[PDB]
Amino acid sequence: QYYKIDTKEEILESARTLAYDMMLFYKGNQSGEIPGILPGPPTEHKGDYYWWEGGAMMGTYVDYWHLTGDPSYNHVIMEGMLHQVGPNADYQPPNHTASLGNDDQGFWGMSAMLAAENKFPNPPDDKPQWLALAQAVWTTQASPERHDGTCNGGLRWQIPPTNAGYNYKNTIANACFFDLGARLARYTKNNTYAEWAEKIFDWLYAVGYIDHETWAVYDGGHVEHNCTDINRAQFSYNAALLLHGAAFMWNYTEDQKWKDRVDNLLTGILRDFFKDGVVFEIPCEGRQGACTADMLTFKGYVHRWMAVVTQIAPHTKDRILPVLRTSAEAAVKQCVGPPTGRRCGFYWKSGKFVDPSVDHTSGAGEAMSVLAAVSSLLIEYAEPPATNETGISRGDPNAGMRSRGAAQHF
Ligand SMILES: OC[C@H]1O[C@H](O)[C@@H](O)[C@@H](O)[C@@H]1O
Ligand SMILES: [Ca+2]
Ligand SMILES: [Ca+2]
Q1: SS3 230
Q2: List the disulfide bonds (predicted).
Q3: Which of 7, 167, 235, 317 is deepest in the core (most CB within 10 A)?
Q4: Ligand 1: does its nearest atom lie under 6 Å from the Cβ of 128?
Q5: Rounded to whole angstroms, how far apart are CA atoms 194 and 179?
Q6: Among the listed residues 225, 184, 220, 188, the one whose alpha carbon sits nearest the alpha carbon of residue 203
Q7: How far apart are CA 197 and CA 97, in angstroms?
Q8: Which of 93, 86, 61 is nearest to 76 (CA)?
């Protein structure tokens, strides 16, 4: 094994080297390149990765600085986050319409929310501020044309009605909107965010994407079947994101129903995704060559989001932290690949390095996931998410409401 994680100082050093190796994939700060994106998209044969994964990377580094105190990459991350905001400061840049799902926009909004929660340095005064960007994403996702009567509500996966997949009302789109609403409620103390989060969670429960008996979290269903054709694939990020949002709602509301939802979602996650203490991407990891570029990132979110749950729902700490520890130990045990002696693969539970080429990418998602898992071992030393009591960001009461906003020509 190359990386050591047995003391705070060892973890910090390992995380620093992991942050270096992940950054080698990113070219957006170099002359002639586009800030905020990993190489791609694959539809243009420019690389393996889609736009939303750039937003996931940005948030990973906002958390990296929060967890380690190392600000080395903060300027690069601010540049990337600001470049992708779009003309209406809502994470809907039109050049990316083909990638404009509610999930894709949501991941960028969640990185902005994280920047506000983590007191990440503010953009210049003339540029959109982190809380305002999160508010803009949430507001566009709450807009009435995104909430029709099919399946008695819920967001569709896609934003443009002509995009393939507009007929799929899926967990991830709704989970992003739910999580943002819960987090905006806690930060701002505005109850309209919370009422929307409650409504969307109740919809996810009613439609049966949350199993009423087992608290498994399924993938979605299609409007032409009234959402009854449930795709029962269980992706780790879906259950983990609902757990994260539920923990914010428990912290904000102190309503026992939210504590019960945290506990039930957590029981399900530990049962389904942790195998002898190691996170496992059940729909695809059982054999090599099946996980997509997107899926290689999910286990990193699981680690980072579950670590935050222990801060805002502290009664969960002893159920979560020991399991994140065994999972991160498995992550580092397999970061031994050539040519560096420390290259990271995906198949942590297996105990062996597998070249990312088996899954047809250069390996950025695997690197991101290990960075997330190792950094998050420092959660016990980190501050909890800030609210507006101590945060430094600024909001915008008209976030998402510009006259040139896309909702005005839907
Ligand atoms: O990567 C898994 C992910 O794939 C697509 O985005 C959709 O099918 C989602 O519903 C699913 O969660
Ligand atoms: Ca998309
Ligand atoms: Ca490829």
Answers
A1: coil
A2: 151-227, 284-291, 335-344
A3: 235
A4: no
A5: 10
A6: 220
A7: 26
A8: 61
